[model samples]
Target: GIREVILCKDQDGKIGLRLKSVDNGIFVQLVQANSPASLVGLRFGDQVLQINGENCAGWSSDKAHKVLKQAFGEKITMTIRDRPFERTVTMHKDSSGHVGFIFKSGKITSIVKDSSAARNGLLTDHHICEINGQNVIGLKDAQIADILSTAGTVVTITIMPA
Candidate 1:
């Protein structure tokens, strides 16, 4: 039997890591927390430049996946471009667990009626600054869901009036 694992892919037919659009450049969205991506501190909105010392300028998903799989269970180097600086991060697999989500930044346009936010007295058009005290500045919908899912009992959200 073949072992199945979660893989990250994009519309560009490339699969190494998921990229999130940001103000300056693309960030490496943390889709699978606890996976190799999150374990390496590859947060949402982190711009990626190289993987395993190879330039990722226009690499496809499949190509990235092939390289990643080859380096699985081992420490691999990744060159990332963050705001105002560039850095290298080492990624490793975590056996503890993993979650599916990516973080992104956007203005909250509306709050769902009768949903958790509404029930908790969250107002519409409120810009969310943090969820449960964790910064939501660059978080994606999936990352938010993951945080909510793991938030022990009650979830606290900080928001600003738009």
Candidate 2:
């Protein structure tokens, strides 16, 4: 059985969200692709106002996860302002459903001196484009792990010089 959801921390120690809403309710920014949020129709540049009937204002990524957990195994209501109209949609969370990928734009900022990537000739300025032919332009670390976990070992990644 599932115990607890794992949270991934970035180098800045901040939790990242897969989808970010713009203009408070006008559009959404896709930050991560292999996240539960993205798999559920939360697209990039989507304007979302509510989740599970709870307002999204002032909610951090962690808080959003909590709210999503609370709605687990149940139908969640979302109020969205897509473009010129406000719409309400119901999404159901399944017991084992999950988004399985990680988004990375391939901007290698820091590679620990002795890490696997560094050992494999990855440099600090290398840009990664794909992993096993899968695009990872906007996936967070956790989302990437999810994808790798599901895809199996020995995955290949595409990279470019920065």
Candidate 3:
């Protein structure tokens, strides 16, 4: 989403932000304490999409500095995009052929770095949807445990990123 926000400088005339251009986009690198941007909850990693309704995509830091600096610490309508959520991760068993994850509320709460789940790209807050072609939803904890505990050398889990 394009998050539109309007902010102004304080009496000291500062937005309280530092920016940098990354391959992905122009991101908010730092938010100064008590600055206008920080007071409005703007923080690092926020991708800037537009400046004053102008499309600033693919702009370099030098260009951004020239354009933004021209504003001279005035109020600007800044637009930012949101991060994606839809993701899938497939995990297999380890040497002992066992998967690892903390399950709760029919979802994976956490994944350890040493666990096979990590090697397969699993992260925290992934919703386990399928296990070995079986739907895990509505399945009992014991039943799920039974499937995982079985002698299936390979365990395939479908996860949705949070």
The most accurate candidate by lDDT is 3
Superior candidate under TM-score, 1 versus 2: 1
TM-score of each: 0.39, 0.32, 0.51
lDDT of 3 by residue, 122-152 (tens): 7767655567756564467777777778837
Q: How many backbone clashes does candidate 2 have?
A: 12
**Which order, best to worst by lDDT?**
3, 1, 2
What's the CA error at residue 36 for candidate 1, in Å? Answer: 3.9
Q: What is the C-alpha local distance difference test score of candidate 2? A: 0.46
Q: Number of the top candidate by TM-score?
A: 3
Q: Tell me the RMSD of model 3 versus the true structure.
A: 12.0
Quantify how close model 2 is to the true structure by its C-alpha RMSD in Å.
Answer: 15.7
Mark the regions of model 3 whose C-alpha exceeds 4 Å error after superposition.
83-113, 116-162
What lDDT is obtained when candidate 1 is compared to the true structure? 0.49
Task: Rank the models by TM-score, top first.
Answer: 3, 1, 2
Decide which is better by lDDT, 1 or 3.
3
CA lDDT of each prediction against the hidden true structure:
0.49, 0.46, 0.69
